[PDB]
Amino acid sequence: NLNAVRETMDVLLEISRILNTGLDMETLSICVRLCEQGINPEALSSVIKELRKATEALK
């Protein structure tokens, strides 16, 4: 399975790039590990945008 979940991790990258999401490789790994727990992703979509707003609040 360890063969399969590296290749599915690589194909998972392209559809996150072409859908124009804010994710790069690192944040993609954080988010795939976070969804693996069982969290609803429609909730995660708001906390990522609130972090990216309040990050710009400092600078």
Partner: protein, 158 residues
């Protein structure tokens, strides 16, 4: 814990250059927005609905590739469900379309003048982009060469 992965989300999205008090406030920001939705159709169908607007805006092979990958990923369900909700707020020759000089028994359609004209626009967008860089490099520095002295440097504050 799961609440610890939210600290690592704050770690990736804010690099370090203070920088020990901002991260706890951003951790509060990460916690405070998660539970407001929790108090208050398939997955690949929305992918087709987004490939449609691509095809409306031209750019055929990109839609043909987006449909190509979900077809083999069904041949991880919850992570593409995040990407359709994060869409459109992040950062974003060939001689076999209008060059009939290469191929083997090339298709006969007479000639072209109606996509060969949008083969110059394919370069015209690049020519219009690489001049906007030099408009935005002369501007950032004429904002320094012309000012009353020391209003862009904090050296007057020393």
């Amino acid at each position: 814990s799961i609440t610890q992965l939210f600290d690592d989300l704050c770690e990736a999205l804010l690099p370090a250059a203070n920088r020990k008090r901002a991260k706890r406030s951003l951790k509060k920001v990460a916690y405070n927005a998660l539970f407001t939705n929790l108090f208050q159709l398939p997955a690949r169908n929305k992918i087709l609905m987004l490939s449609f607007d691509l095809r409306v805006g031209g750019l055929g092979p990109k839609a043909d590739r987006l449909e190509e990958l979900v077809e083999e990923l069904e041949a991880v369900g919850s992570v593409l469900d995040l990407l359709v909700q994060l869409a459109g707020s992040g950062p974003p020759r060939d001689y076999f379309l209008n060059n009939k000089h290469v191929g083997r028994n090339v298709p006969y359609s007479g000639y072209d003048c109606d996509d060969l004209s949008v083969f110059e626009m394919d370069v015209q967008s690049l020519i219009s982009r690489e001049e906007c860089l030099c408009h935005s490099m002369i501007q950032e520095t004429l904002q320094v060469m012309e000012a009353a002295p020391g209003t862009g440097l904090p050296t007057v504050g020393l």
